[PDB]
Amino acid sequence: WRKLQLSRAKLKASSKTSALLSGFAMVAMVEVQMLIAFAICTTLLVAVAMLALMISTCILPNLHWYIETAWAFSTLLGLILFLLEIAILCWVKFYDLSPPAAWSATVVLIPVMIIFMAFAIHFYRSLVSHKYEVTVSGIRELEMLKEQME
Amino acid sequence: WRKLQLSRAKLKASSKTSALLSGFAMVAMVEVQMLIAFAICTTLLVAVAMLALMISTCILPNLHWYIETAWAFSTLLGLILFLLEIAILCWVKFYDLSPPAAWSATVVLIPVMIIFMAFAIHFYRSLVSHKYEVTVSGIRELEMLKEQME
Amino acid sequence: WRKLQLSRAKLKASSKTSALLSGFAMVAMVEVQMLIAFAICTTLLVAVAMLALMISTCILPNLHWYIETAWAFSTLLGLILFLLEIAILCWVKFYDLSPPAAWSATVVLIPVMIIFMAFAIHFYRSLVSHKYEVTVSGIRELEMLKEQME
Amino acid sequence: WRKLQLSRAKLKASSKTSALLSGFAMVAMVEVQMLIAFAICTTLLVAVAMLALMISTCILPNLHWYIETAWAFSTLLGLILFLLEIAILCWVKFYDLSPPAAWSATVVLIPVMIIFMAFAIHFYRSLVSHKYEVTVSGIRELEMLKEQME
Amino acid sequence: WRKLQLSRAKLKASSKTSALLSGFAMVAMVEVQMLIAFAICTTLLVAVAMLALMISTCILPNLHWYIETAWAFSTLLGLILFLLEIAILCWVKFYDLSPPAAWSATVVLIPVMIIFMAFAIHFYRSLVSHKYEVTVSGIRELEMLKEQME
Amino acid sequence: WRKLQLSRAKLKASSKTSALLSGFAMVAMVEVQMLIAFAICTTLLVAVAMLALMISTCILPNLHWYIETAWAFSTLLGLILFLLEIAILCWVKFYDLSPPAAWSATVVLIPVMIIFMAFAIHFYRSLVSHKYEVTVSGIRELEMLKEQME
């Protein structure tokens, strides 16, 4: 039961989060009109969303942890992209007459981008340790019962 | 009971997903203003949505698997279109002064587009294997009872 | 009980579907600025929605099948209009510098428009047949009881 | 109990319906920039909404039918205004280069506007008749109990 | 229990109502570009919302009537501002070439603005009377029990 | 149980509040096009949101008070930023031809900004006192039981 809920929380969370961001990016992209990177970041980011969306289409009809990875990865990947795209936008909006102000965007981006990925590693690190922590405590308890059994 | 839920999940999911994307595409289309393809992709994509919408209008009043196909097909079909349309937009925004950057959009599109359709086949393949697999598991037991029966 | 639910499903479904589409059409209409038809399609489409909206206002306070027709008709009518309006938009956005690409919009429109209305007839046809089908099967059963009754 | 629900359905329905329409009208108004009427219709329509909004703020804390009238009136009044404003918009967006097409907007407006108000009268008429229809049937039943009482 | 609900109804109601209006005002403000007043009204109105938002952040963690005042005041205060800002917008959109039409906006504003604040006083007035009305009826009943007690 | 709810209320509240504000800021930023500060405020504000978003991604899978701080801090921090950004916008829209009207924005900003942060301290101050207030009342009750125990 806990398995389905985990996925469902992932199902709707991704769809709504992904669709609104892609639409906002598309609307802002047509308004203003590094140079080449802009076209790629936008198109690719959208795809990350599309797949997660379909995941929602196929999940209900139907290993559980495997598909789980697809969502956490795709969704988390996008977050980096959204902030990634905005950094470029400032470069696009200012890059013309405002280049001076534009630099502050990409430069300030590095401090936050690192913390975001770095924090993800720390949270994940503590988690793995627990997987091993439970494995040790679990076998120890089984020996206590097996020893008194004799 | 499970039959109605499957459709309902399809009923609302399609409507909301379809209406927002079509509106965003229409808004961005009027802002910027391959050449001919742009007009077609937009208009057609909308239709895919419209039908699915009506499906919601007729389903509640009222074979179940048949209609089911219409939704999975129409919805999945649209996803390819949305990402399909954005690729063209970059070409519409850059195609003028930025043609160089525009190419990265359609090119990068191929890698993701293939994986999307390809993954769909794999998921479907595993599903079919089970449908038949079960058919074998069910009858097998029946023969067991039959032999012991007599 | 089933009667109220059928209407309620119609009550909210129409309001949300109608209001968002009219607003999107109004926003895109002011951005770009067959010629005369454009003004009519937009204004009329909105009205179809407005009435359905009020239907929601008057229904709760308060023959059931009669009002039911108004919703199914108005809502379905709009779907044709939305796709109808977009076809014109392509003709409006392109009609200036892109007239060549514009034709593909209206032409491609015919294939989908027909299928939409045509499919509606088929679904409705099967429904009517069943209504009669049940009417015959029902009376036949009552005669079986009435005959053995003697 | 039925009394509170009727109002609540009115409470949220008005707020959401009113706020989104006013914002859309304000956004489109600044984009394009009968002549004088435009400014009035927009500002006034908003007010109709604002009051209804506050009605929601004061209702929860705290004759019931009296306040009820304020909502039905304000909300219904707005619907006429929204379609009213769009008619003017076409006159504003086309009034420049497209004056010819503009006329089709106001003219086509008359057919729907009449039906909207006319239909409201019919629905209300049937309602009043029932109120009296029940008053007659009710007293009749009481006399049946009073007569057999003797 | 009734205390928490009253606040919660206030918690979400304010956040959604405030955030959407501020964003719409900001979007329309950048599109057009009394003169000085415009900048102030917009910035200040936003603040009124921000505080109410935080109120939602601090309320859940944790006198009840005191905080209650902050919401009713801030929210109601904003309503006047929104209609206030729109009156200025008409003056901003028309103030250039359309000054004549602009006047109708601010002038027509006075009639509705007064009724809004005036009606608020009346509703509040009747409320204060009841508070006292209950205080009198309550003590009277307690004496009835205390008298027969002897 | 109360622990999970507190976080959940924080989970969705932050995501919706953060995503809409960042999109509105991005849309308005591209429309108009202190000078350098504008680029930074926008980019940084977004980051504050992104992290909070991920917090929602990692919380469900899995000390409680620690993570709690991250949300209250990030969310509250943003509020100051949103109003902060708008102050700059007025300076961006007016800063060109309207510099005079622009000053009223930043100046008026100080009065509200202080109250916002100042009020936060007061609410927090009363809270801390209670933490100590309970600590004293609690130990006192335990002694009452321990004393009569002898």
Numbering used by the authors:
A (entry chain B), B (entry chain C), C (entry chain D), D (entry chain E), E (entry chain F), F (entry chain A): 148 to 180, 191 to 219, 240 to 327
The article reads:
Orai was identified as the protein that forms the channel’s pore and STIM was identified as its regulator. The channel is activated by the depletion of Ca2+ from the endoplasmic reticulum (ER), and as such it was characterized as the calcium release-activated calcium (CRAC) channel responsible for store-operated calcium entry (SOCE) before the molecular components were known. The channel is formed from an assembly of six Orai subunits that surround a single ion pore, which is perpendicular to the plasma membrane in a cellular setting. Each Orai subunit contains four transmembrane helices (M1-M4) and a cytosolic M4-ext helix.
In this study, we introduced the corresponding amino acid substitution into Drosophila Orai (H206A), confirmed that it generates a constitutively active channel, and determined its X-ray structure. Thus, as has been shown for the corresponding H134A mutation of human Orai1, H206A Oraicryst forms an open channel that recapitulates properties of STIM-activated Orai. Extensive optimization of crystallization conditions improved the quality of H206A Oraicryst crystals from an initial diffraction limit of 20 Å resolution to 6.7 Å resolution. In this case, the asymmetric unit contains 24 Orai subunits, which are arranged as four complete channels. The X-ray structure of H206A Oraicryst reveals a new conformation of the channel with a dilated pore that presumably represents an open conformation. In comparison to the closed pore, the pore is dramatically dilated on its cytosolic end, expanding by ~10 Å at Lys159. The electron density indicates that the principal conformational change in the pore results from an outward rigid body rotation of the M1-M4a portion of each subunit away from the central axis and a slight additional outward bend of M1 on its intracellular half. Residue 206 is located on the M2 helix and does not line the pore. In the H206A Oraicryst structure, M4b and M4-ext are repositioned by straightenings of both bends such that the regions corresponding to M4a, M4b and M4-ext of each subunit form a continuous α-helix that traverses the membrane and extends ~45 Å into the cytosolic space. Anomalous difference electron density for iron is not observed in the structure of H206A Oraicryst, indicating that the iron complex is not present in the open pore, which is in accord with the dramatic widening of the basic region.
